[PDB]
Every structure is written in structure tokens, then in C-alpha cells.
Paper text:
For the levan utilisation system, the cell surface components are Bt1760 (a GH32 endo-levanase), Bt1761 (a surface glycan-binding protein; SGBP), Bt1762 (SusD) and Bt1763 (SusC)15,19,24. SusC proteins are unique among TBDTs in that they are tightly associated with a SusD substrate-binding lipoprotein15–17. Recently, we showed that SusCD complexes mediate substrate uptake via a “pedal bin” mechanism. The SusC transporter forms the barrel of the bin, while SusD sits on top of the barrel, opening and closing like a lid to facilitate substrate binding.
To visualise potential different conformational states, we used single-particle cryo-EM on detergent-solubilised apo-Bt1762-63. Strikingly, several distinct conformations of the SusC2D2 complex are present in a single dataset, and after further classification steps, three dominant states were identified. Following three-dimensional (3D) reconstruction, electron density maps were obtained at resolutions allowing rigid body placement and refinement of individual protomers. This yielded structures corresponding to the three possible combinations of open and closed dimeric transporters: OO (3.9 Å), OC (4.7 Å) and CC (4.2 Å). With the exception of a few Bt1763 loops (L6 and L7) and the Bt1762 segment following the lipid anchor that serves as a pivot around which Bt1762 moves upon lid opening, the conformational changes between the three states correspond to rigid body movements of Bt1762. Interestingly, the presence of the plug domain in the interior of the Bt1763 barrel in solution is strictly correlated with the open vs. closed state of the transporter; only open states contain a plug domain, regardless of the state of the SusC2D2 dimer. Mutational studies in vivo provide insights into the key structural features of the SusCD apparatus and cryo-electron microscopy (EM) of the intact SusC2D2 complex reveals several distinct states of the transporter, that is, open-open (OO), open-closed (OC) and closed-closed (CC). These structures directly visualise the dynamics of the pedal bin mechanism and suggest that the individual SusCD complexes function independently of each other.
Author numbering:
A (entry chain D): 224 to 1016
B (entry chain B): 175 to 223
C (entry chain C): 1 to 555
D (entry chain B): 472 to 570
E (entry chain B): 323 to 372
The structure:
């Protein structure tokens, strides 16, 4: 079930807000070229007051679109249904083991015409031959998933389309805007037109291995992994026509195919030895990886019958396009690892890799990454054994590095592409190389060429992330109080950055550079208490908490000005958190002509408008008056699992909180203003019914205006809110039938249970939307309520 | 991985398997695990044409 | 370890070292043309119409003042921020066109002429394109960066400045580009999209015409008019040069704006939009995709002003009502009128693009503004709704060529420089105005029966050839440029050349408030609003190497 | 001087289901085996394709259908089948002589 | 549980064939032979230049 649903004006409410917006600006509210007419006048003090309100019956003069009070979110949501079934079976003999499972999932999301499902089989087995010294094994899973996904932007469209627009037009077609009504598409119709854009996805995952133990402590092993998926889909383009929202009469189909084929191969050599007090592992080995991808698709326009049965490429009578390309990479890897344990109380560990990637030139192919960790089982040292209340306590510290090469397969190269221009754009800017050099106006193939996509860099190398870590494990009161702490410092250097080009460089001037650095340090804490009680109740709490800070250390000059990782391209994010943002400081509202004239010069400032702070004190409110106003890093997050067992019943709660987080709300643009949007007459949030006026002087909401004279759309503290939350992620209640009862139906375990996920949300009073975890337009987070069972033989 | 290859050349013995057994059916079966054995083979060949 | 990480290589592209091969040199040339068709969008057409809404010719149109709010700010001269997305956008796009020119020039420079005999005509073509963009950037921003080192490395672009050069020698660096093109282009281009030598002369002249009204001070006012520059406009509009290329005025005005008459004698150089040509929906003029009237559902931008309407009014002898034209609306029954009004402005009661089956009305069906922006439609760039040339992609767009230099421009530009050089050749500038004015008076094919069907009184006459004063002569050329180039997005550009923007537009703001409510709070600030601010992000990335235009605060 | 690349793809899918039920008896010197059961089937084939023309570089990795300039085409079809049946069998020996 | 590989290079130049394979078979009988589940699975990959 859809839960946190956004409150959005209704047809009557829409007309009240509009009258306010008009009269605030001092224009005749009867001049709205929609269907509203207003009986209004002035109060004793001279401020405008609304008396009555009449709406016409149709939105057009020719009466093809009736007037509604449509709740568009209720109209695009539904009660979802989930199903889940899984069977698994296992066998274990002296000479081997064997496992087999079958599974199914099916989930009809709360947004209509979106769903997902999965079929799964897995078989694993292993065999011990000779003297259990030759061993063969296999793990393999096979899966078929299929999905129809929510279109891009339906939540914003549902927020945007006014109640007055009906779901169905008089003729029974889909409803749409006409007359003066805004440029917004019918969101029910979008979802329905997209219901057959289903992909089918087959993934096969598994490995096979051989293991040899030629004598005591010596092992050899070789594993070949296979990871292969393929995805097919027809995407259909049906013709639409919702009022003035038209598509001409375009019909098309695109049959798309993709393949991802990855495989892995390694060989491993390990020695073990136990010398009275010394313990020790050594392991050296080698690994190969390779991915090869391909994708292609055929596109055809114009169909006589508009159903997925007809809409195959062979049956189109219009223009065709063909798409596709491949790519891939490979990795080689040489590694060793060394473990040592003295007297089971001092532990040392050593890792060393040399790692090559096809994504670099040979002059930089490999890089070498060592690692070191130490252990100190304090309690086994004899002077700690005067402490009956502390079972084990172990201090550990580690330093080590890891390469990163997760970059474009083409990162090294200067890329020219033919890009004739066969591909959907938006508003032009296809950047194609075809051109009617002849002046014929077309009708036939044009001459074309090549355009630069990327400048190469001969000396890209491995990026290095380096971590230092320290923590301590503990166990008190004979294993009932347990947990661990963690402190780490984590720095990425020579960071591999897709770096934009300087403006004058022009088309495709970007290049991947090792240029940039970024830290993450923080604390991590686990703590669990568990004990029985002397009336029948077992209780087991185990919670956790953590916090971190992130700081960008250096950055290419053109990425600092870019804003790609931070301050909106007005200030450089070097020295701030990844994703921090700069903006104007909103300092309330001008409430009196007095307060505009005494403020800095502010273009568009009047009574009822946002007062922006004069940060440089220059007596002018201009682009220079912005500062660091947004950081996405919580002060801390935390989780907690309560578990109870009483009298064959069991109860679980899992709580999760994030505390101290800034969110940026873009719904607030739609909820607090009549004109903080590109387009006039959109549906608005229900909060602006409380907008400041002479009438209503106790408010934070700017006075309703029809033009963003004050540019209150500018990034500002007005949109940052406290996105802190605590959520009951899950609660589950269970009964398990006593053994003596189920064991006679030959059942080691029979249990039924009942649960609800995401049932409850605690948030800040200063947050003004619904889900602080999903404050804008992403697929809503539903409340699930579940029943289920467990049977085992 | 071949255990036995029956070839049902007849029609009164292959009539059970379908209408689509007018041209005769070739029944193939695959191997299985015997009782109390753990055997493992390894074949190879390198040829020239 | 090594062969493994080299096997997979880029698919479906040309790499930077390959791109310079001769087999690709002509691909780069074409691609540098292509971006003039494929690089603008509905808010950035290389027509620059979205920005001539500042002019007294037209209003931005659309749903309302928020429908492209940054262009309303431009239209009323208030609440322009240097951070505005359009200003950054147009700056960025125009320099993108420059890229394709320079990339082609970079590889053309290395070509051997003995085995590629068109080497210098191709090179000329590209430098023409490069001048085209630098010219338009210069019009938009005054203080621009000169990007004309096709061998410049990517990194060296960071140390460029919009003040390497003074204002004049910024204009000259443009003139140099079009001059080389004149020296090297062929007289005739059998492939009509390629500029001919006369086009290079035309643009060369236009560059010196804009260069001659000098602003060598710190602000934007006129610091005197240079006649070394003017005598060039004369040299490069010489009729003898234009006749070597076969250019001239179409025998009826409407031909410049009609699909059947593309690449006519007046089209000196045009952007060759095309249909049925292999692309997704066509190489249509998407940049005018907003300006189709409501008859096609959307979007009613670029609507002409009543000011421009009333400007086609004429006195009893067929001459402009210089002083009185805006004091009462154009009334069809009783006013004499210029035939060019019905080729520029589709008006209620009259046919849309010469089609009696589409009569425009003050309706839901034609205008989108409930009357805010009026009820007039821009005729020049739209086309007959029945035309083969008309398709809907994401917007409605045609394949009608956009003409950058009409040969009327060349005659009227020649007229200008002659009038500015008071040197006895004024009766020759009047000779040129009468060329355009008389052609226009007879451009009544396709509207020949408007007297009987609607009542219009066409009445336009040439000026008597007398010994005119320089000041009266300027007024007469100015008026001819008003009626000749209406809605073609160089009216506001003309005013800043003349240093008359504040006086004429601030005045327009008070006269036109009566008819378009938006101008209520409009106010043009001289020595500020004559050019868009250089974009804030651009300056801010420059590390103080860029300098903002005069009148704008230290941000 | 002609360059092109066609990128085919075909797909097949079958699935059956059957539920036999056999019986076995041995009395005296007679044995018999009777069995009955149904059967299901479904075939869902497919294919489609693509086509491009007039490529510049001539190698098997540059010639993907996005690096072309010329005209393009597309193909495709789809087939089907179904079946449902019922069967039976019997056996007899009566003496280990007469089968 | 089987495996396999078979690579053939034809007598006519620049034609070949190669096949990878796998196989898993099993069965499990549970309660005095009144419940028996089993399976048979195969997975190939051939790659022929014609």
C-alpha cells in the first residue's frame, strides 16, 4: 500500500489559490482564461476577501473536456500484491554434498502497471575422491527475471496535472489539458501506454573448481567462474493525444537485445602448518577476468494495428533505424597472503597484489598494493586473567592500499564517432555529422563524418585508496555482552576523474585524468545484549551506530568550477563534503514596505517576498551573496534489532535511523509558491493555501505571486530541510507449532508468521514533505503487510 | 554422456510417443550414479585431418 | 598480465589521432556546417530570435511571463542575473560551432594543395563559419574571446581572455576571417549551402558596418564614427562583386520566406534545413519550434508588437508616418499600408501564410496568452499548414531555409555607410532605398485581392531623388530597415549599433504598455543593458581572466 | 564499393508437462502393466535483425551498426505451436509364453 | 556431473567449430521410496564459422 502521499490542491482549492495570486499582484482574478469566475470584494481594512466561486462545466469552448476534481495520485496508485515461494533440498554423504532450490517472486508495485518477478534454480555439489585429497565441486544458479518499469517523471507529472483535468474526455479518450491549461500529460495514460515495455532477463551464474591436497597442509585449487546475462525487450511507442498533449500520430517499436558475458579464472596455492605454539597460513595465486558486452536493436516506425501483437519490426511501413556496439575489458592479478598467529594471542597478516588492467597502456598497466594487519588477543595474556567478567578482548590495527580502475573501457583513447545522427535527441542538439551539403533538402543519404567524443591520455594509471583502521572486539559476562568498535582513515589518491574540457576546447574535450583526492574517516560501533529470563522470555538485542566525515581534498581546476561534485559551479567543493551545495541565505520574508527599503538592494523585492541575506555587506543582493548551505552527511546513523521468544512465539523489530541530515526539497518549490516553476498554472502543493498576506500575517510561506520577480527559485536555504528520521523497517510475529505436534506430521519445524515492513516513520516537525527518505519524485516507499509460513522435513 | 540409445523403428511400438512419430523416434538417455561407486574418468584426444 | 588488458578497444568511434587523416578532412568540413542546423534548440536558435524580444518589434509570447522567465527578464530589462541559464547557454553553443570550424581547419592546414586543390577554398569556408559565430557572439556579448588558433592545444584555452584585444581589434579579428574568405572563396558555389565569394563580401561589410560605430571608451556609448571602416562597407557591397555571384532582389518580397523559392537570387547565404534526409525527424529548423501559433497546439512565441504593426502605416503619398505612426492603431479601412506588413505579421481576420482556409482570430485557437501578448503571429519563419516541408517532432518545425544575409541587407547596408560618409554619394543611398522600397510596393502577388476581400489600401512610393541632409537621410534608411527586416532578429542589434537603445526602447516601453501589460515595470539601463552580461560561470571559471561588461556588479 | 553489417538474433522456447500413472500386478503366472496420462506442449520461436550501410574503416570491431552512415532496414517474425493429448498402454504374458 | 570441450578446424581454410558443455543429473528418494525428486540439466555453447 502506498503510504506517504503528497497533499496537492483540488479543483476548488486551485481556484482559491489562483484568486489570491491574482489579487495579491493586483490583477483582475476574473481574467484567468480558465473556467473560474469570482465574487469578491474588500474588507473593512481594505485587503481583498473572496466571497463565492463558480466553475464552468467544460475546459474548452467546444465542450470536449469536462471539468473534474480528480485525485491523480489515487488514480495512478493501487494496492500492490507480493508473492513468494521457495523450495530447497540438501543431501550430505561421506563422499560429497548436494543442494537444489527453486524460487519465485512476483511483485505488483503500488504504481499501476509496474511489476517484477523472478524464477530461480540453483544446484551446488561437490565430490571427494581418492583420499579426500582430490576434490571437485560446482556452484550454479539460473535466473529469469522480467519487469515493466515506471516511466521517467510520473510522480512529477501527477504532482503537476490539475484536478480540473478529467481522467477521461467526453468521447471516452484519455483526458488532457485544453484552453489555458498547462503543458502537462495525463499520468494515468502514460503508465498505460508503457505497460507493455517489459524486459526479460536471463542470468546464469556459477563456477566449477578442482582442489588437490598432495600432502598435509598443502592445497592447490583452480576455479573457473561464469557470469552471463542477456536482456531482451520491445519498447513500444503508441500515438497519444491528451487535449493539446500530442505526439502527432507517431507509432514505433524498438526490439532491443543485450548480452553481458563475464568469466573468471584463478589458481591458488596455500600452505598450512601448526608448530606447537606457532600457527601460519601462506597463500599465493593468480587470477584472470574478462568481460565482453554487446547490444543492438532494430527500430521501426508506423503501424496499422496498435497492439504488441502487431508491433513487430517486420510490420512497420515507415522509417527504420539500427543501433548497437560492443565493449569489454580484461584484468590480470597476482597475489599472495600470509597469516601468522603466535600462541593464539598475537596475530600478523600480510597481503600483496600486483594488478593489471586492459583499461591502461602498458607503460602503466600494473600497480602494486600491499596490506598489513595486526592482532592482540589481550585476554589470553596471563595478567588479564584476574577479570572473570571479561571473556575476550582483542585489539587490532591495519594499514593497506587497494587499486581502483572502474572507468570507461575507452578511457585511454581519443574517440571519433561517425554519429550520423540516427538517435532520439530532445530539442535538437543531436550533434550529428550528416549535412545536406548540396542544398537538396534531403530525401536520401547525406554525406557525414566524425565528431570527437573524448581526448585521450597516454598515462592514466591506477587510482589508489589507502585505509588505516583500528578497532576492538569485546565479550563480557560470559558471552552475553558482545560487540566491536571501528575507527578508520580512508584516502583515495590519484583519483581517476572524467574531467571536463575547458570551454574554448569545444566538442568532446573531456579526458580521464589521475587528478583528485578524497578522505573518509569515521567510527563504527556494534553492541548486542542477549539473555534468557526466568518466566519464559528470551530477549536478544543487537544494535549499531556509526558516523563519518567526507572531504574532497584536491580536484582538477575545471571540475572545481564545474560543480560536478559540489558547489553549484559558483564555488569550488575542495575542502567540503562530496555533494555539498552553495546557495543564497533566505532570511525570512519582507513583512512591511519598511523592511524592503532598509534591506540591501534586491531586484524583485517587495512586501511578501523572500529577504535574501547580504553576505558580503555591499548593500546589494547579487550573485556574490551565496555560501555553503547544504551537506548530505548525517551526524550519525543507527540500527537496532529487538528479538523475543516467549511460549513458542517470536517477535522481531528492526529500527533504523539517520540523524542530522540535510535534504534538498524540490517539492517545496511546488508547495510554497504559485510561480516557482517554469510554466504557469501547474498544480500546486496544498501548503500554499497558508501563504502570507495582509489577511494572514502569521506565515513563513511567501505571498502568492504570478511572476518570480524575486527569483525565489534560486538555490537557497529555503529548500534545505531536516531529513532526519527513524523508521520501523520491519516487525514480525511468529508462532511455531510445538515439536511433538508437528513431528508427528513428520515436520522438524512448522511455523507461521506475520509481518509489516516500513510500517512507521518518525521525522522532524521542520520537514514539510511526506517521506524524509524519499522527499521528492522517486518511486514511493510502500507499507507492506505480509503473511507466510515455514515447513521443513 | 550417453547411457543407451533405443531406436524405435516401428509404428506399433512408437505409436505411444505421439502423432509426430511417423518417421520413427530415437530415444536417448543419459548417465546416472550407480550404487556405492565414486568413479571418475578423464578422456582426451589430439587428432589431425 | 598484458595482452589481456589491450584486447578490447573502442567500438564505433574515430580516435583523436585518426581524425586528422585526409580521408576525413571533408567529413569535418560538412560537420562544421551541420552544427548550424543541429546545434541550436528551442531557446537558442542561431536565428537569435529569442533575444530580439528585447526589440520594439515583438514580444516573447508563450503561456505567460514565466514561460521562459529569463527571456521575459530580457524583454523588460529587469531581473537579469549573470547566472541566468540562457545567457550561459547561448555563449556555450556558439563556441561549440567554433569548435567544428577549428577542428576542420586544424586538419585542413596540414593538407597538401597539389593533391587537394580546393585546400584554400575549404579553409576559406571554415573561416567564414568561424567568423559567423564570432560575429554573433560579438553582437550578443560585446566582450568576447577570440578563438582563432586552430592549432591551439586544449589546455591553452584556459589562459584565453575576452580582453586580449581591444573592442575595435576584436571586431577586426572577425573582419580578418571574412576577408580571407572573400580572397579565397569561388565566385559561384554549385553546392548552394557553401558560401560564395559575394557572401564573404557581404558579411565582411556587415562586420565593418558594426565596427564603425565605435565604442572605444569603457562603457557602451558612441565615441565617434570611423570612416576608414565605412569605406570598406562600400568596397565589399560593390554591385560589381554581387553581380559576379548573381545575387539580387526577388521580384516579390514574399519569396525570401517561402519553401518553393529556397536559394533564390536574394538568399546570399542560408542555413540549409532539410526534410526526408535520413535523420530521426529531419534537419528541420527546430530553433523556431516555439513560434508556431496555437493552430498547431503550441507554443505562440515570437509574436510581433503593435509597434511594428503600426510601422507599416504610410501617409497619403506612400511614405512612412515618421512622427505619428504609433498614436493610433492600424485601421485597415482608412489607413494606407505597406505590403510588407502582410508578409511579416499574420493579423486577426487575415490569412495565415497566404491561406484563406486558415483565418486568424482573437482566439483560444491562435494565441495562447488570453490576450496578454496580443493576437499577432510571426509570418516570416512559419509556413502554410498544408506544406510538405512541415513535420511535428517534439515541436512543429519546417525545412524553410534561414537566410543569414538577404541581398536587401546588402543594399541597405551600402545605403547606410554612404549616408554616414557625408560625401556626395547620398543620392546613391536614396537610390538604394528606392530599390528596396519599390520592390516592396509591388510585392502584391499572393495578396493581390486584399483590396476587394478585406479593404486594404496598399500605398508605397520611392523617395524623390533630392539633395537630402544626412540627418533626414538616416531617418529614411532606418525606416526602411524597420519595414524590410521586421521580426528577423536584428532590430535590437541595429539599435545598439546606433547607440539609440535606451532612448528608443525605454520610449517603446511607455508607448506599448497600453497594449502589452508586461512592459508596466520595464526599464532599460543605458551603459548596461546593450549587451547580455558575460555568463557568471564563464567569468568564475576564468580565474579573473574574463572581464564582465560595464554596468554589472562585482559578483 | 559497398559496406554493410547485419546483426541477426533468433530465439526458441519449448516446455512440456505430463502426468502418467502406472499400475503393476503379478498373480498366478500373469503380469500386467496399465498406464494412463496426458501431455502438454508449447513452442514460441522468434527472430529479428538489423542492417546498416556505407562504413568507413573496414575491421570486424569498427563495423557495429552505430558507426555507419547509409540506409538501414529491420526484420523480424514470430511463430507458435501447441499440443494436448492422452495416451495409454497395456501388457500381458499369462504364461511367460504369450506376450 | 560432466564437462567437455571439442575443437575442430576444418580442412577447408578459415572454417571451424568448437563446443563447450556441462551436465548435472541427480535424484533423491525420501520416505521408503514414496517420494522421489530428480533433475537433468545441460548447457552448451557452440561457435561455428560457416
Amino acid at each position: 500500500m502506498y503510504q506517504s502521499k503528497m497533499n496537492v490542491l483540488n479543483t476548488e482549492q486551485y481556484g482559491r489559490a489562483m484568486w489570491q495570486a491574482y489579487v495579491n499582484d493586483g490583477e483582475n482574478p476574473n481574467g484567468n482564461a480558465l473556467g473560474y469566475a469570482y465574487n469578491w470584494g474588500y474588507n473593512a481594512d481594505g485587503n481583498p476577501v473572496l466571497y463565492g466561486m463558480t466553475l464552468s462545466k467544460y475546459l474548452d469552448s467546444k465542450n470536449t473536456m469536462p471539468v473534474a476534481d480528480t485525485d491523480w495520485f489515487d488514480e495512478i496508485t493501487r494496492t500492490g500484491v507480493i508473492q513468494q515461494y521457495n523450495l530447497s533440498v540438501s543431501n550430505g554423504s561421506e563422499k560429497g554434498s548436494s543442494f537444489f532450490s527453486l524460487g519465485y517472486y512476483k511483485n505488483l508495485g503500488v504504481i499501476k502497471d509496474t511489476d517484477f518477478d523472478r524464477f530461480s534454480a540453483r544446484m551446488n555439489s561437490d565430490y571427494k575422491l581418492i583420499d579426500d585429497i582430490l576434490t571437485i565441486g560446482q556452484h550454479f544458479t539460473l535466473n529469469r527475471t522480467s519487469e515493466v518499469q515506471a516511466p521517467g517523471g510520473i510522480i512529477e507529472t501527477a504532482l503537476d496535472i490539475p484536478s480540473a483535468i478529467p481522467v477521461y474526455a467526453s468521447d471516452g479518450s484519455w483526458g488532457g489539458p485544453v484552453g489555458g491549461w498547462p503543458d502537462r500529460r495525463n499520468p494515468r495514460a502514460v503508465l498505460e501506454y508503457n505497460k507493455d515495455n517489459r524486459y526479460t532477463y536471463w542470468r546464469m551464474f556459477g563456477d566449477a573448481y578442482v582442489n588437490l591436497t598432495p600432502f598435509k597442509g598443502f592445497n592447490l585449487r583452480s576455479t573457473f567462474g561464469l557470469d552471463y546475462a542477456n536482456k531482451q525487450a520491445r519498447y513500444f511507442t503508441y500515438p497519444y493525444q491528451e487535449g493539446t498533449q500530442t505526439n502527432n500520430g507517431k507509432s514505433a517499436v524498438e526490439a532491443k537485445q543485450e548480452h553481458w558475458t563475464k568469466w573468471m579464472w584463478n589458481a591458488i596455492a596455500t600452505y598450512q602448518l601448526e608448530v606447537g605454539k606457532h600457527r601460519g597460513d601462506v597463500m599465493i595465486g593468480m587470477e584472470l577476468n574478462r568481460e565482453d558486452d554487446s547490444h543492438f536493436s532494430g527500430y521501426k516506425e508506423d503501424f496499422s494495428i496498435l497492439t504488441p501483437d502487431y508491433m513487430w519490426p517486420d510490420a512497420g511501413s515507415g522509417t527504420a533505424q539500427a543501433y548497437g556496439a560492443g565493449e569489454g575489458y580484461s584484468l590480470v592479478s597476482f597475489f599472495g597472503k600470509m597469516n601468522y598467529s603466535y600462541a593464539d594471542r598475537y596475530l600478523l597478516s600480510l597481503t600483496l597484489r600486483r594488478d593489471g588492467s586492459s583499461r591502461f597502456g602498458k607503460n602503466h598497466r600494473y600497480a602494486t598494493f600491499p596490506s598489513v594487519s595486526l592482532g592482540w588477543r589481550i585476554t589470553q595474556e596471563n595478567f588479564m586473567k584476574e577479570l572473570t567478567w571479561l571473556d575476550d578482548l582483542k585489539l587490532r590495527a591495519s594499514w593497506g592500499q587497494t587499486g581502483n580502475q572502474e572507468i570507461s573501457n575507452l578511457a585511454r583513447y581519443t574517440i571519433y564517432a561517425p554519429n550520423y545522427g540516427t538517435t532520439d535527441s530532445f530539442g535538437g542538439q543531436s550533434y550529428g555529422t550528416a549535412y545536406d551539403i548540396t542544398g537538396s533538402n534531403g530525401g536520401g543519404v547525406l554525406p557525414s563524418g566524425f565528431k570527437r567524443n573524448q581526448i585521450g591520455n597516454d598515462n592514466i594509471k591506477w587510482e589508489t585508496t589507502t585505509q588505516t583502521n583500528v578497532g576492538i572486539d569485546f565479550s563480557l559476562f560470559k558471552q552475553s555482552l558482545y560487540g566491536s568498535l571501528e575507527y578508520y582513515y580512508k584516502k583515495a589518491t590519484d583519483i581517476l576523474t572524467e574531467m571536463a574540457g575547458v570551454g574554448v576546447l569545444g566538442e568532446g574535450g573531456s579526458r580521464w585524468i589521475n587528478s583528485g583526492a578524497m578522505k573518509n574517516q569515521g567510527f563504527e560501533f556494534n553492541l548486542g545484549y542477549r539473555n534468557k529470563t526466568a518466566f519464559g522470555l528470551t530477549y536478544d538485542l543487537n544494535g549499531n551506530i556509526s558516523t563519518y566525515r567526507n572531504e574532497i581534498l584536491e580536484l582538477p581546476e575545471t571540475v572545481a568550477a564545474n560543480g560536478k561534485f559540489g558547489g553549484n559551479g559558483v564555488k569550488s567543493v575542495v575542502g567540503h563534503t562530496y555533494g555539498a551545495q552553495v546557495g543564497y541565505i533566505a532570511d525570512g520574508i519582507f513583512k512591511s514596505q519598511d523592511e524592503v527599503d532598509n534591506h540591501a538592494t534586491q531586484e524583485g523585492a517587495a512586501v511578501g517576498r523572500i529577504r535574501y541575506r547580504d553576505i558580503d555587506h555591499n548593500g546589494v543582493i547579487d550573485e556574490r551573496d551565496q555560501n555553503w548551505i547544504y551537506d548530505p552527511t548525517p551526524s550519525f546513523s543507527y540500527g537496532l534489532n529487538i528479538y523475543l521468544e516467549y511460549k513458542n512465539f517470536d517477535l522481531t523489530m528492526f529500527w533504523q535511523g539517520v540523524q542530522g541530515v540535510d535534504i534538498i526539497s524540490d517539492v517545496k518549490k511546488k508547495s510554497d509558491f504559485w510561480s516557482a516553476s517554469n510554466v504557469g498554472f501547474l498544480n500546486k502543493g496544498t501548503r500554499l493555501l497558508n501563504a502570507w498576506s495582509p489577511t494572514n500575517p502569521n506565515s513563513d510561506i511567501p505571498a502568492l505571486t504570478r511572476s518570480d520577480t524575486n527569483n525565489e527559485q534560486r538555490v537557497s536555504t529555503y529548500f534545505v530541510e531536516n531529513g532526519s528520521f527513524l523508521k520501523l523497517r520491519n516487525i514480525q510475529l511468529g508462532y511455531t507449532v510445538p515439536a511433538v505436534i508437528s513431528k508427528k506430521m513428520r515436520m522438524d519445524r512448522l511455523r507461521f508468521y506475520c509481518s509489516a515492513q516500513n510500517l512507521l516513520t518518525i521525522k522532524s516537525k521542520n520537514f514539510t514533505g511526506e517521506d524524509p527518505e524519499n522527499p521528492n519524485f522517486s518511486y514511493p516507499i510502500p507499507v507492506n503487510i505480509t503473511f507466510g509460513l515455514n515447513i521443513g522435513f | 554422456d550417453i547411457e543407451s540409445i533405443q531406436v524405435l523403428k516401428d509404428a506399433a511400438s512408437a505409436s505411444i510417443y505421439g502423432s509426430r512419430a511417423a518417421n520413427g523416434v530415437i530415444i536417448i538417455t543419459t548417465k546416472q550414479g550407480k550404487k556405492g561407486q565414486i568413479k571418475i574418468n578423464f578422456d582426451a584426444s589430439v587428432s589431425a585431418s | 598480465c598484458d595482452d589481456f588488458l589491450d584486447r578490447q578497444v573502442p567500438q564505433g568511434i574515430v580516435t583523436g589521432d585518426q581524425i586528422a587523416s585526409p580521408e576525413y578532412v571533408d567529413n569535418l568540413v560538412i560537420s562544421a556546417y551541420a552544427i548550424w542546423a543541429t546545434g541550436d534548440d528551442i531557446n537558442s536558435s542561431f536565428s537569435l530570435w529569442n533575444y530580439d524580444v528585447r526589440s520594439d518589434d515583438c514580444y516573447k509570447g508563450g503561456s505567460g511571463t514565466e514561460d521562459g522567465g529569463v527571456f521575459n527578464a530580457l524583454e523588460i530589462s529587469k531581473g537579469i542575473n549573470t547566472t541566468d541559464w540562457n545567457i550561459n547557454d547561448i555563449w556555450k553553443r556558439l563556441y561549440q560551432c567554433i569548435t567544428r570550424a577549428n577542428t576542420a581547419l586544424q586538419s585542413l592546414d596540414q593538407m597538401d594543395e597539389k593533391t587537394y586543390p580546393l585546400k584554400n577554398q575549404r579553409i576559406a569556408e571554415m573561416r567564414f563559419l568561424r567568423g559567423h559565430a564570432h560575429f554573433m557572439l560579438k553582437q550578443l556579448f560585446k566582450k568576447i574571446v577570440i578563438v582563432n588558433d586552430e592549432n591551439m592545444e586544449p589546455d591553452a584555452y584556459n589562459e584565453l581572455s575576452n580582453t586580449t584585444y581591444t573592442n575595435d581589434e576584436q571586431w577586426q579579428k572577425i573582419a580578418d576571417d571574412f576577408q580571407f574568405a572573400y580572397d579565397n572563396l569561388p565566385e559561384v558555389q554549385i553546392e548552394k549551402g557553401r558560401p560564395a565569394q559575394a557572401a564573404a563580401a557581404a558579411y565582411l561589410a556587415k562586420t565593418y558596418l558594426y565596427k564603425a560605430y565605435r565604442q572605444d571608451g569603457a562603457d557602451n556609448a558612441l565615441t565617434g564614427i570611423n570612416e576608414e571602416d565605412l569605406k570598406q562597407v562600400v568596397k565589399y557591397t560593390d554591385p560589381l562583386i554581387m553581380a559576379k555571384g548573381g545575387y539580387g532582389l526577388e521580384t516579390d518580397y514574399s519569396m525570401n520566406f517561402l519553401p518553393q523559392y529556397e536559394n533564390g537570387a536574394e538568399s546570399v547565404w542560408a542555413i540549409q534545413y532539410s526534410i526526408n534526409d535520413g535523420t530521426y525527424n529531419g534537419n528541420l529548423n527546430w530553433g523556431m519550434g516555439l513560434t508556431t501559433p496555437q493552430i498547431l497546439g503550441c507554443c505562440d512565441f515570437h509574436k510581433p508588437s503593435q509597434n511594428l504593426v503600426n510601422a507599416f502605416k504610410t501617409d497619403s503619398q506612400g511614405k512612412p508616418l515618421f512622427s505619428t505612426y504609433d498614436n493610433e492603431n492600424y485601421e485597415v479601412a482608412t489607413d494606407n499600408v505597406d505590403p510588407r506588413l502582410f508578409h511579416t505579421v499574420g493579423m486577426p481576420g487575415f490569412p495565415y501564410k497566404y491561406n484563406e482556409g486558415y483565418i486568424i482570430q482573437k482566439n483560444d485557437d491562435w494565441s495562447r496568452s488570453k490576450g496578454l501578448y496580443g493576437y499577432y503571429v510571426s509570418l516570416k519563419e512559419n509556413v502554410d499548414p498544408d506544406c510538405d516541408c512541415l513535420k511535428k517532432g517534439s515541436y512543429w518545425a519546417s525545412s524553410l531555409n534561414h537566410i543569414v544575409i538577404r541581398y536587401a541587407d546588402v543594399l541597405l547596408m551600402r545605403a547606410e555607410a554612404l549616408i554616414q560618409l557625408n560625401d556626395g554619394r547620398i543620392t546613391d543611398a536614396i537610390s538604394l532605398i528606392n530599390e528596396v522600397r519599390s520592390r516592396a510596393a509591388g510585392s502584391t502577388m499572393l495578396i493581390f485581392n486584399y483590396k476587394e476581400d478585406y479593404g486594404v489600401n496598399f500605398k508605397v512610393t520611392p523617395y524623390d531623388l533630392k539633395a537630402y541632409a544626412q540627418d533626414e537621410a538616416m531617418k529614411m534608411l532606418k525606416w526602411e530597415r524597420r519595414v524590410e527586416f521586421g521580426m528577423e532578429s536584428s532590430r535590437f542589434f541595429d539599435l545598439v549599433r546606433w547607440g539609440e537603445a535606451k532612448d528608443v526602447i525605454n520610449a517603446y516601453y511607455v508607448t506599448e504598455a497600453s497594449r502589452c501589460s508586461i512592459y508596466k515595470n520595464a526599464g532599460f539601463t543605458e551603459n548596461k543593458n546593450e549587451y547580455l552580461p558575460v555568463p557568471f560561470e564563464q567569468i568564475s571559471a576564468s580565474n579573473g581572466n574574463y572581464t564582465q561588461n560595464f554596468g554589472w556588479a562585482a559578483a
